[PDB]
A paper describes a structure:
These enzymes typically catalyse the reversible reduction of aldehydes or ketones to the corresponding alcohol. The structural motifs of ADHs are highly conserved in all known eukaryotic examples; most notably, a zinc ion involved in catalysis, a second zinc ion involved in maintaining protein structure, and the Rossmann peptide‐fold involved in cofactor binding. ADHs have been shown to catalyse many complex biochemical transformations in plant natural product biosynthesis, suggesting that their catalytic repertoire has been expanded.
Here we report the crystal structure of dihydroprecondylocarpine acetate synthase (DPAS), an ADH that catalyses the non‐canonical 1,4‐reduction of an α,β‐unsaturated iminium moiety. We report four crystal structures of apo‐ and substrate‐bound DPAS from two phylogenetically related species. Despite the presence of NADP+ in DPAS crystallisation conditions, none of the solved structures had sufficient density to model the cofactor. Therefore, to assess the position of the bound substrate relative to the cofactor, NADPH was docked into the active site of DPAS co‐crystallised with the substrate precondylocarpine acetate. The 4‐pro‐R hydride of NADPH was measured to be 3.7 Å from C19 of the substrate which is consistent with hydride addition at this carbon. Additionally, the 4‐pro‐R hydride was 4.6 Å from C15, which is the site of the second reduction to form secodine, although we note that dehydrosecodine may bind in a different orientation within the substrate cavity. Computational estimation found TiDPAS2 had a larger substrate cavity than other structures of ADHs involved in monoterpene indole alkaloid (MIA) biosynthesis.
Author numbering:
A (entry chain A), B (entry chain B): 5 to 362
Write the structure that this text describes.
């Protein structure tokens, strides 16, 4: 039984029946604190589109009962004997992944988010063979390598979506030189990831055009996020006028979409960075890719050193997500609103104040 | 009429009926020598898979009668007054493209193969509005910028496929750093482009594995081409054993094929360089691309300065294609054999000795 699996009792909300996707109160347990482990009392957990996709029963490989949530901000309540960088009582945050092989090139050179055996935030076995439970819970236990120090100047609630959506945008931009004034960057899709991509790029001095299928989002894009331009992707005149005008485009969409129009927007040798995870596959336009010498680049989150650097950057530049703070028993309705796009732009669950045992 | 369109008479073989793809003798004409033009008596024309794709009526944009062939080696018989770099009687070669806009960034910085208005080797209008006729003809006229000096020590017949297949492999490797010892390179498909990619990589000192669906090519791959290894892609054990072992893969296939297994062969941050142009669309597996931080990169031919550089490299390192020299009236049978992969590895038409007027 989940409550007997481990010595320390824990509780949260879980999808017990994968065919319905409904979360309900859930008792379970967490491993004892190892020598390099940190126990974290969870304060806030951001909700991302991957949580929704999991809840919609679209990831076969996940094990149920499923406790989702991978944007965790909390307080260290207990550290192992070998832990030194983090002290009890400190504000901390958890990476979007929980472990790596430790031996491959990526791990040894601190690029460990790209470990072939990276352990994702929930739903799969840990090193001890037990299924991981995510951030919609009262406490978690994480190896110290994957725990970050949360800046004092940063809102815990507004900073929580930085741990998956924020780092994905930040790393993709930093890794591919999309963080310098003079760059014209396009951001496709204005959801959680996209709205943070705009904020980070403005902080970098990058000129940003939001590329959207929702014309009512223009005002939010320009007035609230500070984008330099808004491109309605169904406007053939707007699209043709922007041909060859982008150095790079960051694609955040979780649905199937045509890639060829996006490649046409890029100048020769431009980059299309894919950070969204459509559940269905995409079609590759070979001729536009070849004739333009263009690149399709995948990116996923960021390494833990890059994540700490991002958190410090966000604190100094006051970069937070635009959030709605919700109680945990609102989670099923929030999932519906997230499915309809009725959120600007992130749900964050107040775990400390609204979660109680079953 | 094609013979009256221009002042100078010419002849070759053309697809007159695009629905059959059958070539037959064809009379036409070519423009007078402009100030910057070079008239070229064609000696040899390599046959590439794009010629086959054109004769199979798979490129809607091409105009007919269609004279294909874009791997031309010849002799300069006449130069414009302003031409200085090439003298009459010199052995020359033609780039796989015939013109560019001349104004964009790529043109002015000698990256003109990626000009958005590049004029391909045949079947589309030239600057004067007339359809271009390719290398399956007795002579051609080319602006001097797109004419190369052919090394004396290089076989004209064996060197002819360097002008499209050779430059595509060479440029893709040079542009993305796949030309240095220490790199483990995969070459998918052992056709015209693939077999030249192996030869160039061996000359660079790169370790090369040939990835093929035809096990009977193993001996030529290892003994004749000098590949370090041969991977049968339908052997699931062999494929699983090579997971994460490739720094980069060059995909030369002209047919639709699964790309996710190739992404699995790459290490994290690896590159899949696409140089083949399948007529039907390919499927992009986002999750493998996202998981590894991997790249899909398109590349097309090379710029003319790089082409001259490639030709000189081939002369000093004795790089030629493995060819069957054929007479022009064999072209329809050669297309059938090329369609079936029954050639090791390139057809080259002997134009000077076997082409006669209708
Ligand atoms: C930052 C979160 C995203 C979410 N999606 C879908 C794939 C995915 C990831 N975690 C998940 C948890 C539950 C269900 C699906 C996923 C993740 C985690 O990032 C890592 C491990 O470094 C990934 O890479 O899975 C290997 C990335 C990639 C894009
Ligand atoms: C060099 C190898 C060809 C073959 N294919 C198919 C596309 C193609 C090209 N020429 C053609 C002629 C007749 C029919 C189709 C084509 C070309 C030429 O390269 C250039 C202009 O620089 C290209 O890029 O077309 C923009 C490349 C790209 C890959
Ligand atoms: Zn590893
Ligand atoms: Zn140009």
């Amino acid at each position: 039984s989940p409550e007997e699996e481990h010595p320390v009792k824990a509780y949260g909300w879980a999808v017990k029946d994968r065919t319905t996707g409904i979360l309900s109160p859930f008792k379970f347990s967490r491993r004892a604190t190892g020598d390099n482990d940190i126990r974290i009392k969870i304060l806030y957990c951001g909700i991302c589109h991957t949580d929704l996709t999991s809840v919609k029963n679209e990831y076969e490989f996940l094990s149920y009962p499923l406790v989702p949530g991978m944007e965790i901000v909390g307080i260290a309540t207990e550290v192992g004997s070998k832990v030194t960088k983090i002290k009890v009582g400190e504000k901390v945050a958890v990476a979007a992944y929980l472990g790596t092989c430790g031996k491959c090139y990526n791990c040894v050179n601190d690029l460990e988010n790209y470990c072939p055996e990276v352990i994702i935030g929930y739903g799969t076995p840990y090193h001890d063979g037990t299924i991981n439970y995510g951030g919609l819970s009262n406490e978690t236990v994480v190896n110290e390598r994957f725990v970050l120090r949360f800046p004092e100047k940063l809102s815990p609630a507004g900073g929580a979506p930085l741990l998956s959506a924020g780092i994905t945008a930040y790393s993709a931009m930093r890794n591919h030189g999309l963080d310098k004034p003079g760059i014209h960057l396009g951001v496709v899709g204005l959801g959680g990831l996209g709205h943070l991509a705009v904020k980070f790029a403005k902080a970098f001095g990058v000129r940003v055009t939001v590329i959207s299928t929702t014309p009512s989002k223009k005002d939010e894009a320009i007035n609230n996020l500070g984008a330099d331009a808004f491109l309605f992707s169904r406007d053939d005149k707007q699209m043709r006028a922007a041909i060859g005008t982008f150095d790079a485009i960051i694609d955040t969409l979780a649905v199937v979409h045509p890639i060829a129009p996006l490649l046409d927007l890029l100048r020769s040798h431009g980059k299309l960075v894919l950070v969204g995870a459509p559940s269905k596959p995409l079609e590759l336009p070979t001729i536009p890719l070849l004739s333009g010498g263009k690149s399709l680049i995948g990116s996923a989150a960021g390494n833990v050193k890059q994540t700490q650097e991002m958190l410090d950057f966000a604190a100094e530049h006051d970069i937070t997500a635009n959030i709605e703070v919700i109680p945990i028993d609102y989670i099923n309705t929030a999932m519906e609103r997230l499915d309809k796009g009725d959120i600007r732009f992130r749900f964050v669950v107040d775990i400390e104040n609204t979660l109680t045992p079953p």
